[PDB]
Structure formats: structure tokens, C-alpha cells
Design a protein around this ligand. Structure first.
Ligand SMILES: [Mg+2]
Ligand SMILES: [Mg+2]
Ligand SMILES: [Mg+2]
Ligand SMILES: [Mg+2]
Ligand SMILES: [Mg+2]
Ligand SMILES: [Mg+2]
Ligand SMILES: [Mg+2]
Ligand SMILES: [Mg+2]
Ligand SMILES: [Zn+2]
Lengths: 137, 135, 102, 214, 24, 83
RNA sequence: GUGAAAUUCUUGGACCGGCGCAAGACGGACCAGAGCGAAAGCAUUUGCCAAGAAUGUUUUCAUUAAUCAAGAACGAAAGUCGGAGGUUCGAAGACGAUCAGAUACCGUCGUAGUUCCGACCAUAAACGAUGCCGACCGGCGAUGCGGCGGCGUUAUUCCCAUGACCCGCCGGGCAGCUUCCGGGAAACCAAAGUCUUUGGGUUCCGGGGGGAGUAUGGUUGCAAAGCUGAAACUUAAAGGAAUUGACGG
């Protein structure tokens, strides 16, 4: 009770941290072992007010620390991690804020379980946006 | 930094070493004195730069030949290093490894059927090529 | 003037190759022509590998990797400096560049 | 105004008898008020867990779905739901200069469980192999795939969900593929990459009890 | 001028000539 | 090798050469006698059989035809027939 | 979402996360200077239907062949017509940005289209910018198929075949490296070689650059357009390959 379980010292509680680290934004989302129930979600867009640094490591680590103190407020100790890119037909790589948010969570008194990639990879996608001539800049 | 000798001093040092090798030596101060008369060098700075380099090359040629060549040095270097002169020739082995394929080659040459050579079991596997591509 | 014997693409017994898309600009480029780069990346960069290993609950955990195969149109591969222009003689060399292992 | 975590409660999830470890972990859900029921909310929850967590000294690249079918107090009984290899492992097994073979079957368990089994296997080069690429001909792939279909449907169609899960925990099915296929084309990288369920036998309560017990 | 757009401009002019000749 | 003696090629390269490309054509296939096990008589079998051959006594199959050469089933004695 | 933004969606739960359901597209990694096809082109499993190269062949026919005006089948994408379906993408169009301007490049939406069936069109840098058939003329290592052999390892077994390798050989291929064969204006090419030491057979086809693939005639098409195809007039160069320099956001 009291915003946490009654688990003894012998066993620790495992959360799940979805790090949707794309370009232009990074999501850190802590949930239970099914993901059905959520504890906290903080993103760079709601942490920086410059509209450009939504994917910056500066805003990403601040998001990670905020969900970290909230997780400790709920007594969450261990944390399996699911890293996720944009996926689909678009980019399949994590953005800049993945490593900063990951490092911030470790250094904020949290424990780390297993990191796995849940990036959506199509067998073969639909027509990707941009035309056949690419994005001529 | 900045003490690199130029081709002017370098080449002139080599020529006077070859032409006057016995009149030189290991001492810089004697080398500059012989250089005063064995060649006409106008500048003092150029002179003792030449002598300084000559002293350095004397320390090198005394313990091994260089790009420069002395006719006396060549004969002495072939006169030395005559041989390791082992008490027996290095290739008078009492037993010599011989494959069966080479053994029949000597038989077809008619020079086989000797005692010194011994035949070995042919290696098995026929794997002698490196796997192709990267790694 | 024919710059390359293979026309810059590895098409010898075919007539048509299905197109893939550049990951950077999303440009339709033939699969035999695009620069392919299979990259294995650490999930945790070197700046945080110690933090994650220490904070990990597991006594011994090997960080998994990323297995993504990258396709670049030659414009984007040149801009990203994946491929560099070479001299006429050095163009013919097809061995991959050294990994700089030692 | 107030956070829901005040009215959230924590339940503990258990494991079937196939695994020597019982407690996967702890969950949370809202309480029961009006039409919404805490038991109904927790009905149908899928918990991706690692077999390394559920087993003492077995492999880590195998994961399990483990849907909860019933809750009894603060404990949530759980049966098998599906398996899947981790993305790191399945992506690392796909090497160049070799042939991948993929199979899929539909099998009705004696109990009534309709399972869709996906198996993957990769050709193997020999120790004295000098040729760079070790590929498989199309008929060899057809023979290997067909045999893989039948020595994976026989291991499940004649048995129950209990035996199938405790035999795929060490992946005896995969080793059966490798030793059979080595007579045709040698393989090394063979695993049942994924299974999933399609149909269930009308949700019998007694079957869950003997699944966790006798 | 790019030969393709010269070709397209030529096509437009041929349509005008066909329309003028049809009207007559 | 400019001055190769094409008049008398040595037999190791003559056998090496393709069947039609030799100095004089000579087929690689041959005729062999096959002794049916559990029988007494001798049948003639083409070394490159395309049809399944069965000697009259031996009701079993003698040769299983494949692409290049017949598969002589076990228990059959074979021997060449006059070059 | 962008370089930065904005139009746009959001307290009705947007995005995110979980469980399901539907839809129509699409078949990654494996996938290669690898295979097949006359080209265009062809990539999830299974089945059915015919077809095909090469190899094997001491089988049959016996000149039945090669290239081909006229004529004919197929023919990317886009486009046209009719019917289904419209997920994504996306001509036209609107709006936001950028700019001196921006009818654009960038961003949001989105029409025809993109998907299947039937009927058209017959064009692509439809490229190997390189006719087909045949003969000859260097070397080397690979690779795909078929065949023939040989130390050995591995699969099962009680023995051989039979598969996975290893070492070779033959034939047809996709190719690769090297070479003062030879050629070429050179780049380069074992074919673009065997060419003033010029003749193996046979198609198509060019004649300085423009005008111009235009006008006119015919013919094909629903249409867009396709095929055939000039002249007046104008011009001293236009070009191809390499060399040096100058410059490059
Ligand atoms: Mg150029
Ligand atoms: Mg083409
Ligand atoms: Mg907005
Ligand atoms: Mg079309
Ligand atoms: Mg229609
Ligand atoms: Mg759109
Ligand atoms: Mg001809
Ligand atoms: Mg002319
Ligand atoms: Zn690109």
C-alpha cells in the first residue's frame, strides 16, 4: 500500500520502459509487466519550450529523470527496457535522445533489466512517402 | 626542431668522404681542419656544417656500409663475412624427408634406392586452399 | 565516355532489378546499385555502458545489438561520406576498406 | 484531482508447471466499482517474459507471452499463450552466403489447442569449406521444409499443451529438425522462432487447475 | 533548351495546327 | 607451347578432351556384362542406360537410370566388352 | 512536422502503451557483379497445368539449315474506356513556409491515378548506347547447372550407393582478373581481334550542323498519339576521346 506494493527486500518490482526515440521527439513510458497499466510518460516536447530541442539529449535526459523520480515515488526498482524507433517504412534507427535518456535513467538510482528492440519492421512496407526522386533539399 | 641538413652539405660530405677516406676520422675538430685544405669551401658556416655531417657519417660507415661507396670498403666487406664455416656442410643430413611422390620421381630418375632418404606417410585431407572471400 | 565497366551497378545476367529506397531521402534506387551497409551498433553507447552495467539487476548481462541494413542512394552516400571519390586507377579496386582492427 | 495510484492495487502473477520458477512479477490495476471489475480488467493480460527469468540455467533469447486466464485473490494464475525469439537473436541469425528456410504449420492439440508454429533454419558450412557461400538447392529446401513440417506436427498433434511446452523449453523440436536435416543439407541455426495460438478449448476451469497442479 | 521540353512544346504546337486545320 | 605435336597427342589428354573434340571420335560409354544375382546367365547392359533393364531370370531391377550413368544395384558383377 | 517554423490533430483523451477486429496494398533481412526468360520482366508456403536450356546419349530422321522485305505474337512505366476496390503513396489543386519574386524545391491535405478483370496504345538512356549464325585466336582463379572421376571428413547402418564438403576434368552459361595477340582517335575491347596482307553467310541502317522527326500525303488509334516522311531556307563549324590549366556552394 501507500503508492507501492508490500514486497519484501528479497524481491524487487519490475517495470517496463518504452523508449520511443525518434527524430523530433523522444517518449519515455513506464508501465507494468503487460503494458496495460501506465505509471508515467514524459517527453522532450513537454520538457523544452523551444520546439526544436524536442529530440535533444538535453530534453531527453530531463524526461528520463522525471519518470525516474516518479518511478521511485511508486517504488519501482527494476526496469525492463523496450527501445523503439519510428519503424514502419520510415527510419529504423533510434534518434539522438536514446542514449541520453538511457544514461539518465541509470544514473537516477534505477535498476535495469533486459533491453530489447520492439521497432516495427515490415515484411515489406507500403509505398514510402517522398516520391521516387527522394527529398530534394 | 629545425636542424635538417640540405643536399648541398649532404652531397659535398659524401664526395670528400669517398675521395679522402683515410685522412678523415671520428673527431669533428680534426675533420673541419682537413676540410679546410682538401676542398675550397667559401663560408665557415658551410665548412663546419660539412665537417659535422662527415663526422656523423664516419660513425655510420665504421659500423656498416651506406649509400656512399668506398672501393677499399667494398673489398674489406667481401673479405670479411667469409662464411659461418660450419665443420660440416649444412645440407649433409643423415636422414632426409621424402614424399612417396618424390620417391617414385627419384626412381624414375634412377637415382633413388638410397639409404639417406626416408619416405613419409602422405598427408591426408587434400585441404590446402584458403577459404575465399572475407574471413 | 563509359566511366565504369559495370555502369556502377552489379547487373550482369538480369534485365530489371526491383527498386529499394534510400534511408536518408527515400529515393527509388535499384537494389543492385544502392550502397548497402549492414551496421551493428551497441544499444548502449560507450558513454553509458558502465552506468547500465552497474545499474543492471543481472550479475552478467550482455547488451544486445542493433541489426539494421542501410541502403543509400549514391547522392546521399556521397553527402554522408560513406563513399569517397577515387582516382581513375583506384576506382577499379573492389576490396572493402580495412577495418582498422590493429 | 488525485492520482489513480491511490486506488490501484498490486497483484502477483504465477507460472505454469513447465517452468521451475513461479513468480514472474507484480502488476497493478484499478479497483472494483460499479460495472468495471478489477478481475475483468486483468482478464486477457499478456506479459512478455524471458525464459531466462523463468528458468535457472537455460537460454535467454526465448520469450513467452503467458496470458492470464483467471485470478483468485491477490494471485493471478497464468497459462501458456505463445513464444517468440528476441529481435536481437533472430536478426543475428540471418547471415549472408547461406540459405534461410522458414516453415509454418497449423496443428490441433489433443486437448484442443490450435497452434501456429513458425520455425526457422539456416544452412551450415563445413569446417573444411573453402567455397565462400553454402547455399541450398530449391528441391533440397522443399525436402527440408516438408520434413520440418512433419517432424514438427507429429511432436504436437499426438500430445497435449503440457508436454509441448515443457518439450519446447529446451527446444527438442529444433534439435529434431537439425539431426533429421543433416542427412540432406547440414544445418546449425535451427530454432522454432515463434508460436502463437488461434483457438482454445472453451476455457475449461479444471484444466487450468491441473496445469498449475496435478 | 532541354530536348524533352522542346519535344513537349512541339506536341502542343502540333495540336494547335490540327485544331486550326480542323476549323477550316 | 607453339610446337605442340597434334599428330600424336598423348592418351592422358586424349581422354581428357571432350568426346566430339578428340582427334578421332570415340564414345565414352561402353557395353558391360551384368550377372544377375540368384541367376545363372549373363545379360548385356549399356553403361548409360535410360531404360530399366531386367534380365529374363532376374525379375529384380538391374540398373536404375539417372542422368549420366546407370545405377547398378548391389549383387551385380560387371565387366567390359572389347574396348 | 522543419534547417528554423507554420497550416494541421488535441481535456471530446491527441501521441504513447496493451488486447482484439477490418481493409486493401506489399513480400525486408536471406538476396549475391547469383538463376531463369525472346525481350519487356520474374522473390512467402503448398498444389495443379503445360513449357524450356544445358548436360547424359554407340537412339531415331537425314540436310530437314542461317539471316530475313511483306506479314505476325509479345512488349516497363505513364495514358484511354468499362466494372470492382480504394490501405499507403501521390500528377492536378488548395494552404503553410522559403525567397526580391517562388506558379518550385520543404511541410499538411488531397483529385485522377497507384490495386484486380476485360478492351485499347506501342512508346523508354526498351542500354551492353555494342545484329544474328559459324570458324579461329593467350593465361588464371572463381561461380551456376549437368555429367565423369579421385586422398579423405561428416549424415544413417549391417555393406554400397545417396546427400554436405575436399581435389580435379568436360560441356553450355552470368561474369571477373591479367596480357606489347591484335585492334582503335583514344577512352578502352579476348572482342569493338583475325582490315590497304582489305571478300565466311546474311538482315537493318548513317552521310557536316540546323530547319526537323517539322509540313504535306497515306495508314493505325476513342483519344493522347504511333508508323512512313520532305523541301525552302540558314550555317563554318557542330561534334568524339584524351592533355594541361582555371574554377567548384
Ligand atoms: Mg561525365
Ligand atoms: Mg531495362
Ligand atoms: Mg499542431
Ligand atoms: Mg502500362
Ligand atoms: Mg478503370
Ligand atoms: Mg500524404
Ligand atoms: Mg551474314
Ligand atoms: Mg546531315
Ligand atoms: Zn538518398
Amino acid at each position: 500500500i501507500s503508492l507501492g506494493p508490500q514486497v519484501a527486500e528479497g524481491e524487487n518490482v519490475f517495470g517496463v520502459c518504452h523508449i520511443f526515440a525518434s527524430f523530433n521527439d523522444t517518449f519515455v513510458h513506464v508501465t507494468d509487466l503487460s503494458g496495460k497499466e501506465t505509471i508515467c510518460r514524459v517527453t522532450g516536447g513537454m520538457k523544452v519550450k523551444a520546439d526544436r530541442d524536442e529530440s535533444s539529449p538535453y530534453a531527453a535526459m530531463l524526461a528520463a529523470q522525471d519518470v525516474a523520480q516518479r518511478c521511485k515515488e511508486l517504488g519501482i526498482t527494476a526496469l525492463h527496457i523496450k527501445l523503439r524507433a519510428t519503424g514502419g517504412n520510415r527510419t529504423k534507427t533510434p534518434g539522438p535522445g536514446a542514449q541520453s535518456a538511457l544514461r539518465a535513467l541509470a544514473r537516477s538510482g534505477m535498476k535495469i533489466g533486459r533491453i530489447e528492440d520492439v521497432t516495427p519492421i515490415p515484411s515489406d512496407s507500403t509505398r514510402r512517402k517522398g516520391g521516387r526522386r527522394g527529398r530534394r533539399l | 626542431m629545425g636542424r635538417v641538413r640540405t643536399k648541398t652539405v649532404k652531397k659535398a660530405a659524401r664526395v670528400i668522404i669517398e675521395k679522402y677516406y683515410t685522412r678523415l676520422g671520428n673527431d669533428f675538430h680534426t675533420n673541419k681542419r682537413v676540410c679546410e685544405e682538401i676542398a675550397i669551401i667559401p663560408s665557415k658556416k658551410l665548412r663546419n656544417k660539412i665537417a659535422g655531417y662527415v663526422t656523423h657519417l664516419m660513425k655510420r660507415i665504421q659500423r656498416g656500409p651506406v649509400r656512399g661507396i668506398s672501393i677499399k670498403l667494398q673489398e674489406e666487406e667481401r673479405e670479411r663475412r667469409d662464411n659461418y664455416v660450419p665443420e660440416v656442410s649444412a645440407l649433409d643430413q643423415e636422414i632426409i624427408e621424402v614424399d612417396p611422390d618424390t620417391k617414385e620421381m627419384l626412381k624414375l630418375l634412377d637415382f633413388g634406392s638410397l639409404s639417406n632418404l626416408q619416405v613419409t606417410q602422405p598427408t591426408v585431407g587434400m585441404n590446402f586452399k584458403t577459404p575465399r572471400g572475407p574471413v | 565516355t563509359k566511366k565504369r565497366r559495370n555502369n556502377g551497378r552489379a547487373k550482369k545476367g538480369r534485365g530489371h532489378v526491383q527498386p529499394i529506397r534510400c534511408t536518408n531521402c527515400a529515393r527509388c534506387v535499384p537494389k543492385d546499385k544502392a550502397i548497402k551497409k549492414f551496421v551493428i551498433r551497441n544499444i548502449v553507447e560507450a558513454a553509458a555502458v558502465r552506468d547500465i552495467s552497474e545499474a543492471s539487476v543481472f550479475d552478467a548481462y550482455v547488451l544486445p545489438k542493433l541489426y539494421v541494413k542501410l541502403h543509400y542512394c549514391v547522392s546521399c552516400a556521397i553527402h554522408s561520406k560513406v563513399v569517397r571519390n577515387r582516382s581513375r586507377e583506384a576506382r577499379k579496386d573492389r576490396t572493402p576498406p580495412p577495418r582498422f582492427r590493429p | 484531482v488525485v492520482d489513480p495510484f491511490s486506488k490501484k492495487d498490486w497483484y502477483d502473477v504465477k507460472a505454469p508447471a513447465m517452468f521451475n520458477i513461479r513468480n514472474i512479477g507484480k502488476t497493478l490495476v484499478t479497483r472494483t466499482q460499479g460495472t468495471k471489475i478489477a478481475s475483468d480488467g486483468l482478464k486477457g493480460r499478456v506479459f512478455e517474459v524471458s525464459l531466462a527469468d523463468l528458468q535457472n540455467d537455460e537460454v535467454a533469447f526465448r520469450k513467452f507471452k503467458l496470458i492470464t486466464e483467471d485470478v483468485q485473490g491477490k494471485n493471478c494464475l497464468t497459462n501458456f499463450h505463445g513464444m517468440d525469439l528476441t529481435r536481437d537473436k533472430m536478426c543475428s541469425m540471418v547471415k549472408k552466403w547461406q540459405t534461410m528456410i522458414e516453415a509454418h504449420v497449423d496443428v490441433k492439440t489433443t486437448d484442443g489447442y490450435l497452434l501456429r508454429l513458425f520455425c526457422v533454419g539456416f544452412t551450415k558450412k563445413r569446417n573444411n569449406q573453402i567455397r565462400k557461400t553454402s547455399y541450398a538447392q530449391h528441391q533440397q529446401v522443399r525436402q527440408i521444409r516438408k520434413k520440418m513440417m512433419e517432424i514438427m506436427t507429429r511432436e504436437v498433434q499426438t500430445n497435449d499443451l503440457k508436454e509441448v511446452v515443457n518439450k519446447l523449453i529446451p527446444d527438442s523440436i529444433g534439435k529434431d529438425i537439425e539431426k533429421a536435416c543433416q542427412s540432406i543439407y547440414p544445418l546449425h541455426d535451427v530454432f522454432v522462432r515463434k508460436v502463437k495460438m488461434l483457438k482454445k478449448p472453451k476455457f475449461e476451469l479444471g484444466k487450468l487447475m491441473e496445469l498449475h497442479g496435478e | 533548351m532541354r530536348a524533352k521540353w522542346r519535344k513537349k512544346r512541339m506536341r502542343r504546337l502540333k495540336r494547335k495546327r490540327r485544331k486550326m486545320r480542323q476549323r477550316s | 607451347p607453339l610446337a605442340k605435336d597434334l599428330l600424336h597427342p598423348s592418351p592422358e589428354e586424349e581422354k581428357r578432351k571432350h568426346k566430339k573434340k578428340r582427334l578421332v571420335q570415340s564414345p565414352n560409354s561402353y557395353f558391360m556384362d551384368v550377372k544377375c544375382p540368384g541367376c545363372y546367365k549373363i545379360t548385356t547392359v549399356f553403361s548409360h542406360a535410360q531404360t530399366v533393364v531386367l534380365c529374363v531370370g532376374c525379375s529384380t531391377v538391374l540398373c536404375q537410370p539417372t542422368g549420366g550413368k546407370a545405377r547398378l544395384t548391389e549383387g551385380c558383377s560387371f565387366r567390359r566388352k572389347q574396348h
